[PDB]
């Protein structure tokens, strides 16, 4: 008889001993956020379908407009009609409602405030004094259980804790000056150093974003995307599940930072800013890094978004997990073969960055992310084909042989999506039991 799937048992079987799994060498240095393909001058500008050179997202806009007018849901993908094409882009656009400029990357701006003091919720609750009263709990075991329970309330499908490895914190963030209003933000972006100093609280000066030396821990959350929608990549419905999950990320950060603050600690939100989420997720045990460059989780494969919160709250670090992803990616290469831009390498991992967009000095598969971004204006979306085709994105990968869990080696249209299965937040009740949590799952 088939053994009932047990996601907790799977995670226990593949748990590692303590220690960051990322292999580094001496040339590793912290990475300036401006170097990402989204922001760097060498990659920021892309032609639209008329050959006009524009900021990449404006060229992508031109393609969305063209597709709606032509009744298409993606590149050379006809929709049922113009109304369906329109609906997919309306859903995508709406999904981003709680996200600033595609990722919330500006630290201590807008939703990503490093202090709760000015928030309407903090002001309303000020008479109770929860943000002023010293912590009543300092035991890391109890704090880990409390904060993980809160994380699940706040919309995380996965949550893990690691010691903060500063190698993955950006050396300088992309941000805007404090007096710049939103409508000028994309014109007034600047770099600002992120530094660690002996100070009591996270603070921003004119010159620096200062994280306290007491900022010991990072809490990493996984926000599950919708499988049916992502499997339409590179078309519009994959864009929509991406977009909605960015707003879920923002809610998570704000909810959890407020909880931590009301417990008597400080908390720094981040979403896509501050540091490299995949590295934190690997160190916090959510999953393993992969050929495509994403964190692959046992529950969702790479079809999951990441956000993280930094804190001085005492916590128990989770153990890394090794469920064989590295060895599978070594012989799989499906994402590399299916990538429409040939951005993903078919070669071995190296320590040497492929271009300015990669951080050298850590052993990883080196992908050309300027090629990736170049496909987004061409397709009018955020692609995602690599996530969509990855065997680990399939819901059907885990089997039990009578002794232990293992990966099934056999694993290696949009109208129907609109007319088909959906549930709250795009979660899937056929698999939602996999993320149930009791105290034993939160702290050991």
Binding site for ligand SF4 (CB under 6 A): 290-292, 328-329, 332-335, 339-341, 343-344, 372, 375, 383-386, 389-392
Helix (H) or strand (E) holding 223: strand 217-224
Q: Which residues pair with 195 in a beta bridge?
A: 210
Among 186, 190, 199, 201, binds ligand B3R (CB under 6 A): 186
Neighbours of 32 (CB within 10 A): 19
Preceding omega of 234 cis (within 30 degrees of 0): yes
**Positions in 222-241 near ligand B3R (CB under 6 A):** none
Q: Which does 255 bind (CB under 5 to 8 A by kind): its own copies, ligand SF4, ligand B3R, none?
A: its own copies
Within 64-103, which residues bind ligand B3R (CB under 6 A)? 102-103
Distance CA 310, CA 213 (A): 12
16's CB contacts (< 8 A; 6+ apart) are 285, 319, 320, 321, 322
Residue 125 or 351 with smaller CB distance to ligand B3R: 125
> Quick one: which of 432, 367, 311, 377 has its CA closest to 59?
377
CB 147, min distance to ligand SF4, A: 29
Half-sphere exposure (CA, 13 Å, Cβ side) for 276?
27
Nearest to 301, CA basis, from 250, 336, 335, 276: 335
- Least distance to ligand SF4 from the beta carbon of 297, Å? 12
Which of 272, 288, 360, 364 touches ligand B3R by CB under 6 A?
Answer: 272
Pick from 31, 244, 300, 365 the residue near its own copies by CB under 8 A.
244
- H-helix or E-strand spanning residue 310: strand 304-311
Task: Rule CB under 8 A: choose which of 38, 106, 114, 262 binds its own copies.
Answer: 262
Q: Which is nearer to its own copies, 197 or 433 (CB)?
A: 433
Binding-site member from 21, 47, 55, 193 for ligand B3R (CB under 6 A): 55
The span of 11-19, 160-168, 370-378, 425-433 binding its own copies (CB under 8 A) equals 425-433
Please state the closest distance from residue 337 (CB atom) to its own copies, in A.
31
Terminal Cα distance for the chain, rounded: 31
CB of 170 to ligand B3R, least distance (A): 15
Provide the minimum distance between the beta carbon of 441 and ligand B3R in the complex, in angstroms, as a whole number: 29
Contact positions with its own copies (CB under 8 A) in 182-211? 182-183
User: What does each C-alpha distance from 56 to 40, 59, 275, 339, 375 come to in angstroms?
Assistant: 11, 5, 23, 19, 10
Give break positions in the chain: residue before each, C–N beyond 2.5 Å: 412
Q: How far is the C-alpha of 12 from the C-alpha of 294, rounded, in Å?
A: 22
Among 1, 18, 124, 429, contact with ligand B3R (rule: CB under 6 A): 124
CB of 120 to ligand SF4, least distance (A): 25
| Interface residue list for ligand B3R (CB under 6 A) | 55, 57, 102-103, 124, 126-127, 186, 242, 272, 382
């Amino acid at each position: 008889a088939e053994k009932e799937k047990n996601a907790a048992e799977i995670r226990q079987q593949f748990a590692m001993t303590a220690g960051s799994p990322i292999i580094v060498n001496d040339k590793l240095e912290r990475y300036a956020e401006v170097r990402t393909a989204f922001t760097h001058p060498t990659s920021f500008f892309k032609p639209n379908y008329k050959g006009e050179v524009k900021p990449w997202f404006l060229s992508a806009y031109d393609e969305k407009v063209r597709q709606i007018e032509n009744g298409e849901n993606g590149p050379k993908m006809k929709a049922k009609n113009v109304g369906e094409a329109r609906a997919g882009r309306a859903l995508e656009a709406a999904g981003w409602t709680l996200d600033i400029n595609y990722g919330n990357i500006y630290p201590n701006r807008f939703f990503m405030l490093w202090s709760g003091e000015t928030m309407t919720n903090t002001q309303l609750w000020a008479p109770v004094g929860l943000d002023r009263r010293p912590p009543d709990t300092t035991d890391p075991v109890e704090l880990t259980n409390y904060v993980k329970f809160a994380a699940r309330m706040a919309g995380a499908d996965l949550v893990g804790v690691a010691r903060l490895n500063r190698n993955w914190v950006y050396s300088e963030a992309v941000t805007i000056p404090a007096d710049v209003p939103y409508e000028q933000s994309l014109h007034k972006e600047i770099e600002k150093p992120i530094v660690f100093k002996d100070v009591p609280l996270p603070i921003e000066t004119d010159d620096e974003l200062i994280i306290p030396n007491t900022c010991e821990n990072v809490i990493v959350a996984g926000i599950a995307m919708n499988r049916e929608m992502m499997q339409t990549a590179p078309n519009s419905m994959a864009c929509a599940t991406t977009a909605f999950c960015y707003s879920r990320m923002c809610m998570f950060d704000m909810w959890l930072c407020q909880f931590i603050r009301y417990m008597g600690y400080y908390a720094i939100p981040s979403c896509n800013g501050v540091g490299q989420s995949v590295a934190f997720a690997v160190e916090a045990g959510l999953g393993q890094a992969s050929r495509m460059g994403a964190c692959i989780t046992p529950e969702f494969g790479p079809n999951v978004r990441l956000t993280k919160v930094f804190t001085n709250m005492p916590l128990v670090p989770d153990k890394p997990i090794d469920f064989g992803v590295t060895e599978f990616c070594e012989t799989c290469k499906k994402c590399a073969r299916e990538c429409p831009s040939k951005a993903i390498t078919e070669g071995p991992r190296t320590f040497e960055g492929r271009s300015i967009h990669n951080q050298s000095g850590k052993l990883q598969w080196q992908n050309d992310y300027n090629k990736c971004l170049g496909y987004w204006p061409e397709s009018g979306g955020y692609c995602g084909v690599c996530v969509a085709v990855c065997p680990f994105t399939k819901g059907n990968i885990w089997i039990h042989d009578g002794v232990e869990w293992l990966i099934d080696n056999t694993r290696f249209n949009i109208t129907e999506v609109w007319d088909g299965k959906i549930n709250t937040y795009g979660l899937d009740a056929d698999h939602f039991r996999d993320t149930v949590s009791f105290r034993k799952d939160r702290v050991k």
